[PDB]
Amino acid sequence: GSSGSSGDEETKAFEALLSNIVKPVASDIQARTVVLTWSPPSSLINGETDESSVPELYGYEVLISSTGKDGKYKSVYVGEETNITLNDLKPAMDYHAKVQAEYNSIKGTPSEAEIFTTLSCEPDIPNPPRISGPSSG
């Protein structure tokens, strides 16, 4: 049932909205597994449209370049959820990551890169980078 153009106006808003998210943050980083948490894109519709309308299934894809941000990116996971755990990674390594949004067959631009270092197969890291409030000096 291919007719042709289907309300392009919508496609545009998606090209910008889907590309209006924030770089994924790395937490509870482990040997090869890690906790990647990212927030949804910000709608610039200006409220012109209802609030309980915008979709929340923005297919987010996690990209990583064990080599570097100036090389090739590989897919590790792909879903709608916001928080996901990575796997099949390399311990004692340092690479960048990014999350791209895609909805209605519309692939937008990924967010900034998030460099995160993983621990070694064995229990080395003493404690996580977690910060417990500010500290004088």
**Count of the separate structural domains:** 1
Give the distance, in angstroms, between the N- and C-terminal Cα atoms. Answer: 66 Å
Strands of the widest sheet, in order across it, are 4-3-7-8
Number of helices: 1
- Level-2 CATH architecture: Sandwich
> What percentage of residues falls in helices of 4 or more residues?
under 10%
Find the CATH superfamily.
Immunoglobulins
Secondary-structure class: mainly beta
CATH fold label: Immunoglobulin-like
State the shape: elongated
Order of helices and strands: HEEEEEEEEE
Which percent band covers the strand fraction? 25-35%
Radius of gyration: 18 Å
Main β-sheet: number of strands, strand sense, barrel status?
4 strands, antiparallel
Report the top-level CATH class.
Mainly Beta
Subcellular location: Golgi apparatus membrane
Protein name: Fibronectin type-III domain-containing protein 3A
Organism: Homo sapiens (Human)
Function: Mediates spermatid-Sertoli adhesion during spermatogenesis.
SSE layout:
Layout: H1 8-17, E1 25-27, E2 34-37, E3 59-64, E4 74-79, E5 83-86, E6 94-95, E7 97-103, E8 106-107, E9 116-117
Antiparallel strand pairs: 1-2, 2-5, 3-4, 3-7, 6-9, 7-8
